[PDB]
Design a protein around this ligand. Structure first.
Ligand SMILES: *[C@@H]1O[C@H](CO)[C@@H](O)[C@H](O)[C@H]1NC(C)=O
Ligand SMILES: *[C@@H]1O[C@H](CO)[C@@H](O)[C@H](O)[C@H]1NC(C)=O
Ligand SMILES: *[C@@H]1O[C@H](CO)[C@@H](O)[C@H](O)[C@H]1NC(C)=O
Lengths: 75, 495, 75, 99, 50
C-alpha cells in the first residue's frame, strides 16, 4: 500500500500546516497503544526478551521499546 | 498596517550601511521593517505561482479488469500460451493447478496455467513539474500610513503589489508619498522546485518530493504518454488468487484515493485547480531603503486637539494600536505622539507608526506603538489640550527575551541557513554562523532524512543519554547538545 | 488508516490461500529495503548508535535491526 | 445462514453543508446550532482576530466549522450464530467405476 | 465482512477496531455515523480560515 510510505520525513516542511498534521501527529502512537492493549502476551514476552538480552537497563528498555514499536508495524 | 493582527509577525529594525536589510518572506506570516528616518513598511508574501508545469508521471489510483481469460497445459508439457500475453494492456500471471484424469490430462502433476485480464485505468494521480524560471512570486508592500482602514486590512486596496520572477532580479514599487521601495529577491533559492512535484489528484494538489513521488507503488505512465494504456507497474493494483491450487482468478484491488490521502501525510496542500498556486514556502529578499522617504515630513506639528475614536488595543506582540482624530486648523500636520513614564520625564515607548500625520481633518489616522512593560502614558497632542492615556503592558524583559529566543529557534527550524538572512545587515558573525549552519544542517539532514518526529525524539533521547554517560567532557557536551537539538526539532517538526 | 492494521496475526488461518498473501508476505521487507537505500544517512547513524549501545555483537546487531526496521515504519 | 449485521462501516463519504462560526478573543469558543446534529462533523480551531477582521481585540478568536457527513459506500460486517452453520460433505467410495 | 461484491472472514475484535466511521447495524438511515472524524480532515493553514 502507498499508505505505508507517507511523505513525512521528506524535509520540505514550511511554517504552513501539512496535509494531516493534526490527525497524523499521534496516529502511530495510538496504533502502538491499541496493539499493545489487544496483544498483552507479546508485550510480556518482549519485556522478558529485552531483560535477558539487555545487560544494562538502558539496553533492556531500548530493546523492549523497539520490539514493541516494530511488532505492530509489520503486523 | 497589514501586519497588525497577524500572529506570525516579525519586526526587523535597522538597515546596513548602504541602507538595505535582508528579510525572508514566508507564506502566512509578514515582516514589519523599521529604520531611523525611514518609513515603517509591512511586507507579506501572499502568492506563489508556478507557470506551465510539465507532466512527469501519471499514476493510476483506480482501475478495472475486463476480458479475463485463462489457458492450461498438462503437467510437464511446459507453459500455456495466451494471445493476450503479447499485449501490455493485459496483466497476466503464470501458476500451477492440480491436473489429472478428472480434468482431461493423462498425467497427474501440477499443470501450468496462465490468467490474463485487461487493465483499464479509471482515475489518475498526475504529477507535474515546474522549472524555477516560471515561478512568479507576489508581494504586497503596505506602508504604515495610518489610514483609517489600513490596519490589518487584507483587501490590499491600499498596499502596493509587486511580482517577483527570476527574469528580473530587481523589483521597484512606488509607494505614493513614500518614494520607491526596491526589493532584490531570490526566487531561485526558495523552494527547490527542480526537486519537487506538483501532485494533482481529483481536484486536490500537494507539493511532494520528486524521489518520494517516483517511488510510489502504483501503476504509472511516463507522462509523455498519449494512448494512456501501457501502464507499467500494474501488478501493484491487481490480485491473482489461486485459493486451493485449483483455479486462478484476478481481481482489481480497489481504489487508492484514500490510501494516497493517507500517504500524503506530511505534504503541504496546494491549489492546482486553476494556475498551480502555492501558498507555502518562503522568499528571501534584500530590501533597499535608499529611495524611501517619510511621508508627511516637512509638515508642521498639529497644535489642535485630538480625540480617541477607537480605544487603545494591544496586539499579540506587545504593540498597542490606537485611532485618533484631529480637530485643528493645520489639517496636513504631524501628530505629537509620545509614550512617557508615569512622571512624564522619560520617553519610554517607541513608535512603530513612525511620523504619524493628519492627512485630513475628518480622517481618523490610526497609529501603532510599542509601549514599555508596566505603566506608561500615551500623550497625544500639544499641551493646551492634550490626551494623556494610561497603559499597562503585561510581561517582562526576561520573558520577551525568552520569547525572542524561542521564535529565533523556530525560524531556524522551519528555515535552514536561510534563518541567518532574515535580519542580517552584512556581518562577519552572521556569515560565519550561516556557514556553520550550512555544514551542520547538511550533516543533520543526511542523518535524519525520511524519519518521523517520534523517531527523532527517540534518537535525541538516546544521544543525550550517551553523552550523559560519556567520560570525555568534550564528547559528553557535544553529544548532549546534539541530543537536545534533536529533541527540540522532533518536538517542533510536522505541519 | 485501515491499511495500517492489516489483519495478519489474528489466527483464523487455514490451508486456503488468504487475501493478498503472495505480495504482503514480502512487501514490508521490500519497503524497508527501499527506505534503507533511499536514506543511507540514517542507517549509518543507526549502526553507529547500535555499536555504541550494544555491549556484545548480538546486542548491537539486534539493536541495529530493530532501529532500521522501526525508522521507516514509525513514520 | 441468517447473518445479522453488527456494524456498517463507511469507506467513502462526502460533505455538503459547510458552516462556520467565529468568536472574538476572550469571548470563549463559538457555537453552531449544527454541533448538536449527529449527521454533521464539527471542529473547533482558533484564528487571528483584530480590527482588520471587524473584531476589535487583536487575539486568537475561536472558530468552529461543521459539515454534513454522508456515506456513499459502506462495508457490512454481518455475523452468524454458530448454530446456523451447515457443512456439506461428499462421501465417495473407491468402487473403481463411474457415475 | 462484505465490501462491494467481495466478502472476507475476519476476526471480530479486528473488525470492531477498524478506524473508519461505523453505524450500529440496526441503523436504517445512516445519519449517526460514529467516527466521522476518521474520514474527514480539518485544515487550518496558518490561522486565516478553517
Ligand atoms: C474486450 O471485451 C469487450 C466486450 O466487453 C470487447 O468489446 C473488446 O473488443 C474486447 N477486447 C479485446 C482486446 O478482446
Ligand atoms: C443543505 O444544503 C442544501 C443545498 O444543497 C439544502 O437544500 C439543504 O436544506 C441544506 N440542509 C441543511 C442546511 O441542513
Ligand atoms: C478595508 O479596506 C476597504 C477598502 O479600502 C474598506 O471598505 C474596509 O472597510 C476596510 N476594513 C476592513 C475590510 O475591515
Amino acid at each position: 500500500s502507498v499508505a505505508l510510505v507517507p511523505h513525512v520525513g521528506m524535509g520540505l516542511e514550511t511554517r504552513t500546516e501539512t496535509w494531516m498534521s493534526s490527525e497524523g501527529a499521534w496516529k502511530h502512537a495510538q496504533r502502538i497503544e491499541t496493539w499493545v492493549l489487544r496483544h498483552p502476551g507479546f508485550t510480556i514476552m518482549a519485556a522478558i526478551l529485552a531483560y535477558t538480552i539487555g545487560t544494562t537497563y538502558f539496553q533492556r528498555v531500548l530493546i523492549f521499546i523497539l520490539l514493541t514499536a516494530v511488532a505492530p508495524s509489520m503486523t | 498596517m497589514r501586519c497588525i493582527g497577524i500572529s506570525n509577525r516579525d519586526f526587523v529594525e535597522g538597515v546596513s550601511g548602504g541602507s538595505w536589510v535582508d528579510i525572508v518572506l514566508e507564506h502566512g506570516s509578514c515582516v514589519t521593517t523599521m529604520a531611523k528616518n525611514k518609513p515603517t513598511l509591512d511586507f507579506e508574501l501572499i502568492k506563489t505561482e508556478a507557470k506551465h508545469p510539465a507532466t512527469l508521471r501519471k499514476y493510476c489510483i483506480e482501475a478495472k479488469l475486463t476480458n479475463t481469460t485463462t489457458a492450461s497445459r498438462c503437467p510437464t508439457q511446459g507453459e500455456p500460451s495466451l494471445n493476450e500475453e503479447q499485449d501490455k494492456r493485459f496483466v497476466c500471471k503464470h501458476s500451477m493447478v492440480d491436473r489429472g484424469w478428472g480434468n482431461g490430462c493423462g498425467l497427474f502433476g501440477k499443470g501450468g496455467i496462465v490468467t490474463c485480464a485487461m487493465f483499464t485505468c479509471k482515475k489518475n494521480m498526475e504529477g507535474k513539474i515546474v522549472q524555477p524560471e516560471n515561478l512568479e512570486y507576489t508581494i504586497v508592500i503596505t506602508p504604515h500610513s495610518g489610514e483609517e482602514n489600513a490596519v490589518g486590512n487584507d483587501t490590499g486596496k491600499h498596499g502596493k503589489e509587486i511580482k517577483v520572477t527570476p527574469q528580473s532580479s530587481i523589483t521597484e514599487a512606488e509607494l505614493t508619498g513614500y518614494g520607491t521601495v526596491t526589493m532584490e529577491c531570490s526566487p531561485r533559492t526558495g523552494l527547490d522546485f527542480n526537486e519537487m512535484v506538483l501532485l494533482q489528484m481529483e481536484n486536490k494538489a500537494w507539493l511532494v518530493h520528486r524521489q518520494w513521488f517516483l517511488d510510489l507503488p502504483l501503476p504509472w505512465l511516463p507522462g509523455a504518454d498519449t494512448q494512456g494504456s501501457n501502464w507499467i507497474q500494474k501488478e501493484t493494483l491487481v490480485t491473482f488468487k489461486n485459493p486451493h491450487a485449483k483455479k486462478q482468478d484476478v481481481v482489481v484491488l480497489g481504489s487508492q484515493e484514500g490510501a494516497m490521502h493517507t500517504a500524503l501525510t506530511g505534504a503541504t496542500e496546494i491549489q492546482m485547480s486553476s494556475g498551480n498556486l502555492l501558498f507555502t514556502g518562503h522568499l528571501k529578499c534584500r530590501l533597499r531603503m535608499d529611495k524611501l522617504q517619510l511621508k508627511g515630513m516637512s509638515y508642521s506639528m498639529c497644535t489642535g486637539k485630538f480625540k480617541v475614536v477607537k480605544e487603545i488595543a494591544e496586539t499579540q506582540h506587545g504593540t498597542i494600536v490606537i485611532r485618533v482624530q484631529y480637530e485643528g486648523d493645520g489639517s496636513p500636520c504631524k501628530i505629537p505622539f509620545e509614550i512617557m513614564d508615569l512622571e512624564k520625564r522619560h520617553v519610554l515607548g517607541r513608535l512603530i507608526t513612525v511620523n504619524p500625520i493628519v492627512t485630513e481633518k475628518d480622517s481618523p489616522v490610526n497609529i501603532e506603538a510599542e509601549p514599555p512593560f508596566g505603566d506608561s502614558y500615551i500623550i497625544i497632542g500639544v499641551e493646551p489640550g492634550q490626551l494623556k492615556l494610561s497603559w499597562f503592558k503585561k510581561g517582562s524583559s526576561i520573558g520577551q527575551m525568552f520569547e525572542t529566543t524561542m521564535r529565533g529557534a523556530k525560524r531556524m527550524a522551519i528555515l535552514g541557513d536561510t534563518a541567518w538572512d532574515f535580519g542580517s545587515l552584512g556581518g562577519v558573525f552572521t556569515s560565519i554562523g550561516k556557514a556553520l549552519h550550512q555544514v551542520f544542517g547538511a550533516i543533520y539532514g543526511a542523518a535524519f532524512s525520511g524519519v518521523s518526529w517520534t523517531m527523532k525524539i527517540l534518537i535525541g533521547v538516546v544521544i543525550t543519554w550517551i553523552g550523559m554517560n560519556s567520560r570525555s567532557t568534550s564528547l559528553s557536551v557535544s553529544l548532549v547538545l546534539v541530543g537536545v537539538v534533536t529533541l527540540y526539532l522532533g518536538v517542533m517538526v510536522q505541519a
